[PDB]
Design a binder for this molecule. Sequence first.
Ligand SMILES: CC(C)(C)[C@H]1C(O)=C(C2=NS(=O)(=O)c3c(CNS(C)(=O)=O)cccc32)C(=O)N1Cc1ccc(F)cc1
Length: 559
Amino acid sequence: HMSYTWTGALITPCAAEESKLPINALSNSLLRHHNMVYATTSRSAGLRQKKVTFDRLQVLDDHYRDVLKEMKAKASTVKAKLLSVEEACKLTPPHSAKSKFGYGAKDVRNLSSKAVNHIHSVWKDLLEDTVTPIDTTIMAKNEVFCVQGRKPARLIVFPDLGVRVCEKMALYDVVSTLPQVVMGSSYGFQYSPGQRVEFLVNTWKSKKNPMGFSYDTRCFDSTVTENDIRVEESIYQCCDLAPEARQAIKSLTERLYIGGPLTNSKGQNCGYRRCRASGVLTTSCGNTLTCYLKASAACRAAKLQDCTMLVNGDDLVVICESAGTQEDAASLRVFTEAMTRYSAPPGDPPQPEYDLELITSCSSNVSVAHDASGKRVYYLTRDPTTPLARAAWETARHTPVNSWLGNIIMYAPTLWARMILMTHFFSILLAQEQLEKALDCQIYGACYSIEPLDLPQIIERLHGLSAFSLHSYSPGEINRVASCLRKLGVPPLRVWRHRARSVRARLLSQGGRAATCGKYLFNWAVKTKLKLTPIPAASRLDLSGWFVAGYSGGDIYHS
Ligand SMILES: CC(C)(C)[C@H]1C(O)=C(C2=NS(=O)(=O)c3c(CNS(C)(=O)=O)cccc32)C(=O)N1Cc1ccc(F)cc1
């Protein structure tokens, strides 16, 4: 029962790959220690292949079937609809991988006859044939990291453009609607960061003696079995669906989700997958359900008292009622034993935490600062090393995903996003006159095209106005940022405050939406602080399509 089999054909690139941080005139204003930053390339793919290739054994007990029955009872209340071809096409990202059959993502977006005719033919074939495995492409992802020594490239596996549009037709409503019905408040992808921090704090405060822990599954996608994927299909099929949608979903499950052949960029056969594909629509929903199913069942096994789970795909955090520190630790071993029997064994062994701030989930921890009134406010933050490593790369190279922008949006209230990322990138945008130019970033796996001038209103909506007023950050948080800057050779925060005053004056000069950016984003930079009030255009923002579901690998775009 192996996750993959390989033919020995190489995982090959589709363009030149850089591994060394590209340096330009702007690089040194952010980061001096250039040799610390690197991009993964397909040269390391063989190391990743070894890591993701193993045997899966699963033993499923009454706890598992008990939780599953209940999940299915909730799934049976969901009514999901088929998307039209037009609706599915309009969710396709403009720069999505072109089809092997002679059209691209813009042909799809424009509903071009050739595109739409192909999509119709893939759909018909899905309904007519429920056995023939569907071809996928396996690619090495190029991602930027700081050394620690160097990690191998991650692998993405995805079907052709035509199939991706059919997935949407069949499953977009389901993967968007089902998970919150099944899991309720435990489905993480429904929350803004403000909502998520609130849920975490409220949940913590709701226990008499809280204990909390995160669970890291080693290579979760490879731990996912044919059983797991058929189980997911059986949850989908509990929904009230049109007969045509039922067939499409059974077919995609048999032919695509369960497994299939892997083809490299040069068209050669690299092997065969029998685990979760990283690049399908159901990757996030399937991972979330399957992780929640397994963990709920393991919580029962361990007899964890008054558990609340929070699950984003394969990222899992649990907060419960402590039974004492020794009992807690023992319960955790049992928990991990159960997860392992279910095929989800750990990377790091989990550990019990008695302080919310010491838990990492979605790569983030709770911390505390103060608003203008002096009131405590909790916010989500993280070690800034990877964010700043990538910011350094994106200073000198244009990338398909601007991580700096997703980091500003999602970590707006943080010391490091406000002082460094905002200051640095607005300074660049000013200089090139690109404040109004829409950029793409990825939030919960979906692709959004966002104008930098819109950030204040986006930030108010996700975080509230306090994001623009926070101060007296904790010593532990100040210290971690200061350490990171010393590690990467980033100028100290006193330097960034100086530049921010400049960037702010520059933005104020321009008036309009630029001055709003100066006024709200950089109020921290001046001693005589302005009074920040709700931004009118914020209540006007269409944050529909934001924070409904997760869509990692799912080829979803919002305009
Ligand atoms: C923009 C961002 C900084 C990268 C943001 C985000 O979009 C993800 C995130 N994107 S994802 O790939 O869909 C995903 C999976 C996907 N796992 S899977 C493959 O199993 O679907 C599992 C867990 C998280 C995420 C994330 O963790 N972030 C930090 C953050 C999270 C919540 C906050 F409130 C604040 C910050």
